[PDB]
Design a protein around this ligand. Structure first.
Ligand SMILES: Nc1ncnc2c1ncn2[C@@H]1O[C@H](COP(=O)(O)OP(=O)(O)O)[C@@H](O)[C@H]1O
Ligand SMILES: Nc1ncnc2c1ncn2[C@@H]1O[C@H](COP(=O)(O)OP(=O)(O)O)[C@@H](O)[C@H]1O
Ligand SMILES: [Mg+2]
Ligand SMILES: [Mg+2]
Lengths: 374, 637, 374
């Protein structure tokens, strides 16, 4: 075949988004979880299967304890990650990685060890001709088809912010904020408890993740919505648990995402996301700011909440000079923006020379990741 | 058709060793007959599956020899007549061949101590009964089914209430025409039965149950909302069944759906799933067919007449399908392979004892491993029930355990038994087949799909009992029945048992071996397709036989021959002629510089490795080149 | 022979259900009773036979006092148990236990001593190559051919409840309730006495056991049926005693099994069986409950009463979320479910390595029962 295709994998914590480069959507997207049988089984002709990976784990949740191998964009446990990748290639895609160059995503400002060790695995686990490790934000910017913008990247892992102008990139200006979907989830299960509902275990932690993925939304003004919580009508929603129990969540709903804008709720000093965006833009040269204000791109799973764009717009506009208009461009399909970006990058002809080649690695070692790529 | 098989040739063969004459069947069967009168022990002739080859036709020639030798009313000419019967019931149109024997045929020719024919009987060990229920993607079930369908007129069809192929669930892949016009063949087969002396009544009864097996398909069990048990809302089909047998519809309906079981001494019902009852239906189909087949063989042997019985000994002739390989290779393929494994092992053992005794006859003591052992780990891989459990055993375990999938099966066998060297998981990209083993023939790939379903043969004792009570003579007489009988009972298990019976029977006797190959698809001579012959050499074990004898000292030459023939080799070593012919060889081997590993000194012969005589022969052509040169030069100058 | 077969014995109190592994029904099933001649005999050329065991005792009831050696899943008297096993092997099966591995059932949450001592006997009484001791509930779940369910196991001994998901098993969730067929019998003979019929002795205690085994049934609403007892027509049934006396039992019939649902009748606080099932399910992880509500399996002799399933369905459905449908799967042939399960387990190939081997016992002692098996 010509070009051999190429493989693309986005692993921020939470989800693996994988598929062939050269396609508009990934084939396989499943949770990055390694569940292990915590309870000793007593039958015969079970499994045994030491552990389960991917949406298999979601299916068989109750038995397993689930461990997310990636936290804050850092891989805690490598064998687990390897297992997840194994599952992606063999269980879903059904590819021999020897037959494809593979692109990995990775978060900014992230420890060297992850990049280096990541590459070490790809070469000395799944024998592969070539690979590349790329910054998440840039990829989403490509996916949006814009050359310039400040990409607000918040996955389940961590939140990141990379201003870009006319390609280029500003290292000093790049900002990385420790908040995530996962931290919102931890907050949310906390806030439920004041209602009586107690979710103590990893299994049901994912149930609240599911709740947040739909029920929660961001206030266009927090205090107003909280005021109107007095007369509860629309702000309460019934949710059905798999157990059959019913949950009813009022104001607690929208204050969950509020945390992004008020990390004091979580107890961290680190400024809210909008202020971090200012922190990034303000670090940039005076000249370019005009378009960064106007070209803010949101990406990642934890920007999905309804109404986030609007709130960011209102806050940024409030803070900034009203001399210039602040457009925020947040597409739907943002969740997959990183992966799409990866697809487009591996599809690019010129890119086909920038790969880290197996050969190059074998001569020069794992450390070469930083040398060559950003 | 070759001029061979005259009287002069056969007379010519008599009382001689195999080497003494040219290769022929008459020779090997002479070996068997002579070994019997000589050794007074029973003999067996193994023919390995090949078409369609006319293996039987050849075997008629063997019988012809047998008749002429043993004397003192023609031969059993009805043996020719038997072929279409067993062919019709037993064989099916498959990818390898349009006619292939699923069942093994064991033909016993009974001999008194005098060496005369007391009579003969047929025995049929292995059957694939699962073929009737279930089939390959592009193949046909047994011939009789199709030839019944097209062949029977309204006269018979109206009694049997046969329908076209599309009507039956149990018939896969539709009609799958196949004709051949058919119908004519069926007509031939009826006469073939009749001459044998079965009554028209009996034939109609037989054909009725052959419908009955097919009818088991028309019954539909419908799962019920909420309850497990399921049921049969449509009485029509099973009503038809009940007409076709002695069964009362109601009796049968309760029995099948909710059977009663003896929990001593007081009976209790059972709840059965839709799946379970379906398997029971398929079971009774399959077991019914098997029973039918058995009865045919016994009733046939009654149609064969014997003189004064029980005297004294027999010669078995085994016709069974050989080691099979397809692209896909399903479950039945595995069972066939398993049997061919054991047969092959017997051959190795036989060869082993032959060589070990040959060494003593030549006075060479040598110890070497049993050749049979080569196959043994592969056999244990498939068979061994216990410590590590076998593929069949593990399949059975999968089948019974609650929610069993095919995938859980393969995973389980990998986990349980992957450390086995003959077992290979392909892994990674396809590799369409999900696991593979390494036989004597080579590496074969197996697809695990629907193996659990094929394996299940649970049998209701209640319905069985009803059959035992049938009104009609035929079926009731058939069901005239220890193991795990009832539920459990798996096809793999039964098959294994049946093979064990056969291996015991063959093992009791002294076997002899014939290997049949077809040159081509053409059905014409003068064309040998090397690839096809290679394939056949793989599946008949002949390659294994060569790789066996290589391990020993295959080439055996007498002292006298070795000296007279090869003397040209070493003028130096060979003395002035002390003679006695031992000393000659001593000298020759000595100066020719050969490893003592590579030969032995025997009484009448020297045993040689492979390639030793190749070197010596090269020294004879080199020596001959030297001598041709010296001669020609001397004459010239 | 290949596989040697294997032997299976279910001893919850009341009945020994024994037979060959690899068969769909046990060969021998007889009452676990040791009757002793209480009255001194005066003839010559009697017996003497110090005691009778099995349905022999049933035949010659009047003379004997019967002692059930097992109470509440605990063996009171060991020599008696040994005698019963003796009877099973020699009198019915006609096997040398040296020639067969033997599987025993045993109830959950049961004292260690019983398992340990049980094994001690099997090795040092009936010399046997191997044995295993297995939980009753699991076996029935196997027999039902389902991988998941909450098995309500009530024999004559005691009632037990073990939730199982996808194999596995939840120790904390396992519940054991002190009610049984035997307690119902004791209640029943009490309740007859208000009618005039007085059954004071072990002999006739079994007569009332027999009555209960047919005449009694469970109300689909207790109060309604008791109300309709006013106009007695169908609720009375004549029963014939062996004495020739006739008994006529009305409302007293169905309130006997009612006890399972209202142990206040018996005077115990311990919740009714349906509430105990909820107690089990509620202990389990939120995720799996959905299928446990739907997969409840009833086993054991004292679930045989007509209408139990229906009542359990109505009560559980009433208590639970009606968001999810509560199927209860109670097969007929449930009585024998444990034994069938045993048959299937010993039939399993892989199981053939999990046996407790004679050898292993001889090295490691009796205590190894817990170490190896559940
Ligand atoms: N539909 C949704 N609405 C709101 N929040 C969501 C939604 N889907 C996912 N999330 C949140 O975002 C997270 C997924 O982020 P993801 O894009 O997988 O990050 P990454 O690409 O870095 O792995 C989830 O864990 C959840 O907290
Ligand atoms: N047909 C029946 N109908 C109602 N109750 C019964 C029936 N048969 C037995 N029982 C009750 O159940 C008990 C038998 O339980 P069993 O299954 O032997 O327990 P285990 O298996 O633990 O020994 C009897 O003592 C009786 O109280
Ligand atoms: Mg991301
Ligand atoms: Mg019990």
């Amino acid at each position: 075949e010509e070009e051999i295709a190429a493989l693309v994998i986005d692993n921020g914590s939470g989800m693996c988004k994988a598929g062939f480069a050269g396609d508009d959507a990934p084939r396989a997207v499943f949770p990055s979880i390694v569940g292990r049988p915590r309870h000793q089984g007593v039958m015969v002709g079970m499994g045994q299967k030491d552990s389960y990976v991917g949406d298999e784990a979601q299916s068989k949740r109750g038995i397993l304890t689930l461990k997310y191998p990636i936290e804050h964009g850092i891989v805690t446990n490598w064998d687990d990650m390897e297992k997840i990748w194994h599952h992606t290639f063999y269980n879903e895609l059904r590819v021999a990685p020897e037959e494809h160059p593979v692109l990995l995503t990775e978060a900014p400002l992230n420890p060297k060890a992850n990049r280096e060790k990541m590459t070490q695995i790809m070469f000395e686990t799944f024998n592969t001709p070539a690979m590349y490790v790329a910054i998440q934000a840039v990829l989403s910017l490509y996916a949006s088809g814009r050359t310039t913008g400040i990409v607000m990247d918040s996955g389940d892992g961590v939140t990141h912010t990379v201003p870009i102008y006319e390609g280029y990139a500003l290292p000093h200006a790049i900002l990385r904020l420790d908040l995530a979907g996962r931290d919102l989830t931890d907050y949310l299960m906390k806030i439920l408890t004041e209602r009586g509902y107690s979710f103590t275990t990893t299994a049901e932690r994912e149930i609240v993740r599911d709740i947040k993925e739909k029920l929660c939304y961001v206030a266009l003004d927090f205090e107003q919505e909280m005021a109107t919580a007095a007369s509860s009508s629309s702000l309460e929603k019934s949710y059905e648990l798999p157990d059959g129990q019913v949950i009813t969540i009022g104001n607690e709903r929208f204050r969950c995402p509020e945390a992004l804008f008020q990390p004091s709720f979580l107890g961290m000093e680190s400024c809210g996301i909008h202020e971090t965006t200012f922190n990034s833009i303000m670090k940039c040269d005076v000249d370019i700011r005009k378009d960064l204000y106007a070209n803010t791109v949101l990406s990642g799973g934890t920007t999905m909440y309804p109404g986030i764009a609007d709130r960011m717009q209102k806050e940024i506009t409030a803070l900034a000079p009203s001399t210039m208009k602040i457009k925020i461009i947040a597409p739907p399909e943002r969740k997959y923006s990183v992966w799409i970006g990866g697809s487009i990058l591996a599809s690019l002809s010129t890119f086909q020379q920038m790969w880290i080649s197996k050969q190059e690695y074998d001569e020069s070692g794992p450390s070469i990741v930083h040398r060559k790529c950003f | 058709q070759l001029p061979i098989y005259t009287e002069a040739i056969v007379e010519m063969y008599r009382g001689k060793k195999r080497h003494e004459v040219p290769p022929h069947v008459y020779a090997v069967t002479e070996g068997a007959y002579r070994s019997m009168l000589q050794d007074r022990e029973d003999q067996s002739i193994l023919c390995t599956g090949e078409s369609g080859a006319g293996k039987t036709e050849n075997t008629k020639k063997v019988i012809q020899y047998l008749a002429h030798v043993a004397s003192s009313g023609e031969l059993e000419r009805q043996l020719l007549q038997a072929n279409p019967i067993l062919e019709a019931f037993g064989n099916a149109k498959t990818v390898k061949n349009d006619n292939s024997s699923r069942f093994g045929k064991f033909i016993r020719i009974n001999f008194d101590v005098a060496g005369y024919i007391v009579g003969a009987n047929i025995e049929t060990y292995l059957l694939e009964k699962s073929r009737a229920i279930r089939q390959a993607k592009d193949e046909c079930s047994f011939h009789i089914f199709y030839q019944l369908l097209g062949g029977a007129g309204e006269q018979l069809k109206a009694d049997l209430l046969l329908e076209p192929c599309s009507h039956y669930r149990f018939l896969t892949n539709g009609p799958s025409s196949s004709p051949g016009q058919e119908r004519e063949l069926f007509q031939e087969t009826l006469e073939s039965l009749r001459v044998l002396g079965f009554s028209h009544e009996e034939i109609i009864s037989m054909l009725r149950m052959v419908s009955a097996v097919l009818q088991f398909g028309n019954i539909a069990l419908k799962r019920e909302r909420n309850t497990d048990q399921a049921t049969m809302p449509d009485n029509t089909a099973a009503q038809k069944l009940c007409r076709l047998l002695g069964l009362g519809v109601t009796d049968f309906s309760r029995a099948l759906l909710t059977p009663r079981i003896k929990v001593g001494r007081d009976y209790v019902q059972k709840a059965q799933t839709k799946e379970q009852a379906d398997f029971a239906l398929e079971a009774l189909a399959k077991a019914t067919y098997e029973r039918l087949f058995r009865w045919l063989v016994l009733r046939l042997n009654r149609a064969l007449d014997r003189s004064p019985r029980q005297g004294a000994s027999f010669l078995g002739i085994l016709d069974i399908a050989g080691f099979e390989i397809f692209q896909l290779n399903s479950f039945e393929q595995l069972c066939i392979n398993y049997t061919n494994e054991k047969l092959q092992q017997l051959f190795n053992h036989t060869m082993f004892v032959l060589e070990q005794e040959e060494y003593q006859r030549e006075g060479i003591p040598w110890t070497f491993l049993d050749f049979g052992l080569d196959l043994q780990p592969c056999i244990d891989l498939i068979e061994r029930p216990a410590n590590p459990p076998g593929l069949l055993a593990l399949l059975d375990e999968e089948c019974w355990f609650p929610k069993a999938t095919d995938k859980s099966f393969v995973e389980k066998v990998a986990q349980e038994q992957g450390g086995h060297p003959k077992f290979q998981r392909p892994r990674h990209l396809r590799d369409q087949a999900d696991f593979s083993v390494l036989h004597y023939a080579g590496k074969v790939d197996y697809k695990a799909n629907e193996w659990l379903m094929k394996n299940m043969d649970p049998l209701n004792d209640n319905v069985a009992a009803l059959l035992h009570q049938s009104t009609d003579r035929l079926t009731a007489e058939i069901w005239k029945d220890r193991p795990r009988r009832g539920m459990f009972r798996t096809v793999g298990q039964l098959y294994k048992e049946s093979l064990s019976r056969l291996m015991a029977t063959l093992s009791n006797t002294n076997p002899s071996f014939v290997r049949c190959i077809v040159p081509n698809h053409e059905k014409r001579a003068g064309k040998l397709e090397p690839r096809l012959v290679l394939d056949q050499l793989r599946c008949n074990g002949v390659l294994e036989g060569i790789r066996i004898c290589r391990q020993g000292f295959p080439n055996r030459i007498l002292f006298q021959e070795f000296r007279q023939r090869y003397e040209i080799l070493t003028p130096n070593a060979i003395p002035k002629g002390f003679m006695d012919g031992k000393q000659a060889c001593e000298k020759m081997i000595q100066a020719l510089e050969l490893d003592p590993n590579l030969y032995r000194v025997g009484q009448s012969k020297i045993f040689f490795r492979a390639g030793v005589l190749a070197q010596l022969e090269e020294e004879r052509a080199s020596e001959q080149t030297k001598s041709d040169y010296l001669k020609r030069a001397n004459e010239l100058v």
